[PDB]
Amino acid sequence: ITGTSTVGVGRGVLGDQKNINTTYSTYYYLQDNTRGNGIFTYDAKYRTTLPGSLWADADNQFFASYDAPAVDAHYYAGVTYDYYKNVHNRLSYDGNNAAIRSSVHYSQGYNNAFWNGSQMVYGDGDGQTFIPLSGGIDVVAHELTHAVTDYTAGLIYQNESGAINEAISDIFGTLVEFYANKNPDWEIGEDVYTPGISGDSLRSMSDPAKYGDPDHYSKRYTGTQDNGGVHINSGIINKAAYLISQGGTHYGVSVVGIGRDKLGKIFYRALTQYLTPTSNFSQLRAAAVQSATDLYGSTSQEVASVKQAFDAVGVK
C-alpha cells in the first residue's frame, strides 16, 4: 500500500525484541519499503486462503503473542534479502527485486512451511512437533531459497533433482543463519522444532544419519514417499556441502575444508549457471567442480576439496 516508511518494534517467537520496517497509512502495516520492491507479511488467520490480509497494527508495537510469528517472518525475510544482495549481488528471488510475500498463522496446528509458487507460508505448529516455524531464521531462508531455485535452476521437486532442491534450501538456510550470526550451526530448524526436547533438530547437515537420513549415496532412498525422498536424500548433498566447508574424514575419505564463504560462492554459481531442472547428483558434482574451477582455478584447493567431498558421499 501507499504510505510512509516507519520503524516498529516487537518480539519474535523466541521472545527476542527486534525492530521491523513498517508502512504507515491509517494503520501500521508489515510492509518493508527499504528492500527491493518491498517485503510484505500477511495474516492467514488460521485458515488456508492465501495470502490473507496484509498485516495491520494500530500502534506499530508488535508484542502480542499473536504478533510473534509475523515479526519473525518479516524480519528474517529482510535478513535473507540482505544475504542474497550483499553476498551474491542478487536482488530478491527473481534477481529483479520481486516483492517478497509471506503469510503466517496458516491453518491450525500446521507442522510445516512452504513456498507455494508465489509466496512463503508458515504454520504455527502444534506446539509439540513445532512452534511457529518463522521463528527459525534457517527455516525462513530455506523457504525463500525455494523461490530462488524456482527462478534459476528450476530443479524438479522429486527424486534426485528434488533432493538437490532441498539441499540447496538447507545450505543457504544455514549460510543465512551464519550471516546473521546468532547461535549458528549446521542443523536445520533447531529453534522451532520440538520445544519439549532440547538439543535436537529436524535435520543435521553435519551428521544427517543422526536422524536416519543418508550420508552416502549407497544409502539413498529410492521409494515413492516424500516425492521420492526429497527431504531424506538431501542428507547426501547436505553432508557433501558440510564437508566442503568444514572438512573431515567420512567413510575413510578426507576432505580439506575451505570455509562457508567459498561453499556459498561455489553452490550459488552452480545453482545459477549450471544446474537445470533435471540435474541429478552426478550432474551436481560436475556443476560444483566447474563452478569452483571458474572461481578459483583448475589446480586450486577449492576444486580438489569439492571432488573429495563428493567422493566421500559416494557421488561420482
Binding site for ligand 2G8 (CB under 6 A): 112-117, 133, 139, 142-143, 146, 157, 188-189, 202, 231
Q: Which of 21, 169, 234, 238 binds Zn ion (CB under 5 A)?
A: 169
The least CB distance from residue 111 to ligand 2G8, in Å, is 6
The least CB distance from residue 277 to ligand 2G8, in Å, is 14
Residue 275 near residue 239, CB atoms below 8 Å: no
Q: Which of 32, 43, 150, 187 binds Ca ion (CB under 5 A)?
A: 187
Range 127-146, binding Ca ion (CB under 5 A): 138
Strand ranges inside the chain, DSSP E: 4-11, 17-25, 27-29, 31-32, 39-43, 53-54, 56-57, 61-62, 100-106, 113-115, 120-123, 187-188, 203-204, 248-250, 253-255
Q: Rule CB under 5 A: say whether 16 interacts with Ca ion.
A: no
CA atoms of 228 and 233, how far apart (whole Å): 9
The least CB distance from residue 73 to ligand 2G8, in Å, is 13
* CB-based contacts of 40, cutoff 8 Å, min separation 6: 30, 31, 32, 54, 99, 100, 101, 102
Residue 242 annotated as binding site: no
Residue 41 near residue 25, CB atoms below 8 Å: no
Our answer to whether residue 143 is catalytic in this structure is: yes
- Pull the grid cell for residue 273: 549457471
Q: Rule CB under 5 A: say whether 234 interacts with Zn ion.
A: no
Our answer to whether residue 231 is catalytic in this structure is: yes
Nearest alpha-carbon partner for 82 in 172, 10, 152: 172
Q: What is the contact mask toward Zn ion in residues 128 to 167, using x (rule: CB under 5 A)?
A: ----------------------------------------
Q: Rule CB under 5 A: say whether 200 interacts with Ca ion.
A: yes
Residue 72 near residue 140, CB atoms below 8 Å: yes
Which of 74, 105, 143, 160 is catalytic? The answer is 143
CA atoms of 222 and 170, how far apart (whole Å): 21
Residue 226 annotated as binding site: no
265 CA to centre of own chain: 16
Q: Rule CB under 5 A: say whether 294 interacts with Ca ion.
A: no
Residues that are catalytic: 143, 231
Residues near Zn ion, by CB under 5 A? 169
Q: Return binding residues for Ca(2+).
A: 57, 59, 61, 138, 177, 183, 185, 187, 190, 193-194, 197, 200
